[PDB]
Write a protein that binds this ligand. Structure first.
Ligand code: YOH
Length: 211
């Protein structure tokens, strides 16, 4: 059937949709279609394209209050490396507290981690019951499942700037150094190529956590 209404979704509403690039883009919900329990959402993207999307591949074009965001909430968050300024899917790992200076920790689907503010977050419209089950990468997916379900039990390694440690990259250990800690995140310098990465201090990519 064609629906005009589904939960708090209404045809002709402005919405974010997931493109095949895995980045999310502003569009218009132009149809809702049912097939038994199954629901699909037809989006007309503002620049280029129509897609027929699952409810977990559309996001509201508003910022939720803090009260509607939990550890495990499925979100789209802004990420910015220079002029590359894009919306990507992730999971809320941490809600605002004194220790994180009232920020949201996001674990992106691609294994990047970042603190963001409310103004950087959009809620996914129809997340899965197990929010993490639509993370394509199995190792990220299994990690987030364990993290979210054990929360607030979070083994983390206490690290200090200058500390020499082994960090995982593409399935091997690399000589590295702790450059900076910011709440639950450590900035690791890989000594081989002199590049940095922000890593969750409870990640098994940190050899001390792994052991
Ligand atoms: C803003 O500051 C940073 C931005 C970085 N951006 C990228 N890339 C852009 C891809 C974005 C992904 C999008 N996702 C979230 C959806 N990468 C970084 N570091 C890569 C690590 C290489 C280590 C390599 C180690 N050797 C041994 C191979 C970055 C570090 C940064 O801080 C120090």
């Amino acid at each position: 059937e064609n629906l005009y209404f589904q939960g708090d979704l209404i045809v002709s509403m402005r919405i974010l949709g997931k493109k095949r690039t895995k980045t999310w883009h502003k569009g218009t919900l132009i149809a809702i279609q049912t097939v038994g329990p199954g629901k699909k959402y037809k989006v007309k993207f503002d620049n280029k394209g129509k897609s027929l999307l699952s409810g977990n591949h559309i996001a509201y074009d508003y910022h939720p209050p803090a009260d509607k965001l939990y550890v495990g909430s499925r979100v789209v968050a802004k990420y910015k490396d220079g002029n590359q300024v894009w919306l990507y899917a992730g999971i809320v790992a941490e809600t605002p507290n004194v220790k994180n200076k009232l920020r949201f920790l996001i674990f992106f689907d691609d294994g990047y981690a970042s603190y963001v503010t409310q103004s950087e977050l959009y809620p996914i419209c129809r997340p899965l019951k197990k929010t993490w089950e639509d993370i394509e990468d199995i190792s990220c997916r299994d990690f987030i499942e364990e993290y979210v379900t054990a929360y607030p039990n979070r083994p983390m390694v206490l690290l200090k700037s200058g500390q020499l440690i082994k960090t995982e990259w593409e399935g091997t250990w690399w000589k590295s150094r702790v450059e900076e800690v910011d709440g639950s995140l450590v900035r690791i310098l890989f000594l081989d190529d002199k590049r940095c990465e922000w890593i969750y201090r409870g990640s098994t990519r940190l050899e001390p956590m792994f052991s």
